[PDB]
Every structure is written in C-alpha cells, then in structure tokens.
C-alpha cells in the first residue's frame, strides 16, 4: 500500500536524521582530537572576539570552554573556561580566565586533590610578545581540585585576569582573535 511506501520513507528520513546528528557529533570529536595536547600545555585560539564579547554582554553566552588537554597520554584531563566580559569581581570590567579539572578515564590512578602548578596567560600577538600571565597553586581544600564527580569540576583561576581596557587597547587582539595559553606543571606526577 502507498501507506507502506510512506512507512518506509518515514523510516529513512528518521534514519537520515540520526546519521546527520551522528555525523555532526563526530565532527566535534575530530576537532577535540585535532586540537588535543598531551604535555600539559594548551594554546586556545578564540576567533570572532568582537562578536563573542557582544554575546557575553547581552548574556547569550557568558563563557566559552576550550578543548581538553592532558598532562600526559593517560593523566589528568583539563581545559580552560573564559568569560569575555568577566565573572565575579571582574564582571563588566575584566576578562576572567579559569582552569577546569575534568573527569578523566584514569582518575582512579592519579593523585588527588590535584596539585599541579597552573600558569594562565594571554598571548601578545604584537611584536614585543609581552604575554600577560599569572600562576597559581591549586587549593587542596578547594572543590575545584578534588577527584571529579561530574564531567568537570567548578572552574577556578583569575576572575580579574586582564582589564578589558588593557586587552582591547593593545596588540593582544589581532585579526579579531586572541590566543589563550595554559601550562600545567607535569614535573611531579608519575613515570617509573
């Protein structure tokens, strides 16, 4: 019956939809993969600063989080979270840069709470390369550096990293894009 033809047509469209989602997801897997890093250093490239900043003000998107980077092929999983228009004591005045401990497939083998030194920083695309950066030491008692429960613990870093005045009136922004860099000290943990 023509109704049976439609039953099959409907089934294919549904399948085609699954395939579309499925395909798109892999696209994200590819990106994450193509942008990964396993030496505890992450260089995050943020394009469309102007737009994204505006979306942060209007409240469409308060923060962006980077792709995950690792301290080693099988160590801590981490990433960065930024608020182009500020968070906490920086909302409206600064750009807040936070570090994020994510749940990793090998957390049952890694030390806790997380204690590696973290250096946060914004690259200076200018010619003098005056990179802006800070370095903290995880707070053992903080819930941001304890063995993960969900996908990622509560971000933690510098709410008052850079003054929006400084950033935008300098050579940190070129081609409508800035680069953020994080450096985890892999110096301590593992290795026979």
């Amino acid at each position: 019956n023509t109704g049976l033809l439609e039953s099959q047509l409907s089934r294919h469209d549904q399948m085609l939809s699954v395939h579309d989602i499925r395909l798109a997801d892999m696209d994200l897997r590819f990106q994450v993969l193509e942008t990964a890093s396993y030496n505890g250093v992450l260089i995050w490239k943020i394009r469309d600063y102007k737009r994204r900043k505006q979306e942060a003000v209007m409240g469409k998107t308060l923060s962006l989080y980077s792709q995950p980077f690792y301290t080693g092929y099988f160590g801590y999983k981490m990433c960065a979270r930024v608020y182009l228009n500020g968070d906490g004591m920086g909302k409206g005045t600064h750009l807040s840069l936070f570090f994020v401990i994510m749940r990793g497939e090998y957390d049952a083998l890694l030390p806790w709470p997380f204690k590696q030194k973290v250096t946060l920083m914004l690259m200076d695309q200018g010619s003098s390369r005056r990179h802006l950066g800070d370095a903290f030491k995880p707070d053992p008692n903080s819930s941001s550096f304890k063995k993960p429960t969900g996908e990622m613990n509560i971000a933690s870093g510098c709410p008052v990293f850079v003054a929006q005045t400084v950033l935008e009136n300098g050579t940190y922004i070129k081609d409508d894009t800035i680069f953020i860099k994080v450096i985890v000290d892999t110096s301590d943990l593992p290795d026979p």
Partner: peptide, 18 residues
C-alpha cells in the same frame, strides 16, 4: 598564587569551543 573559584558555577550560559 591562590585560585579564586568561579561564581557563574550556577548559570549554564556556555558554548563549546575547540
């Protein structure tokens, strides 16, 4: 050298970006 949490640990206004 002491990490300050993140207040927005309450709102879910965030976008993936690799």
């Amino acid at each position: 050298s002491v990490p300050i949490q993140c207040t927005d640990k309450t709102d879910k206004q965030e976008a993936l970006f690799k």
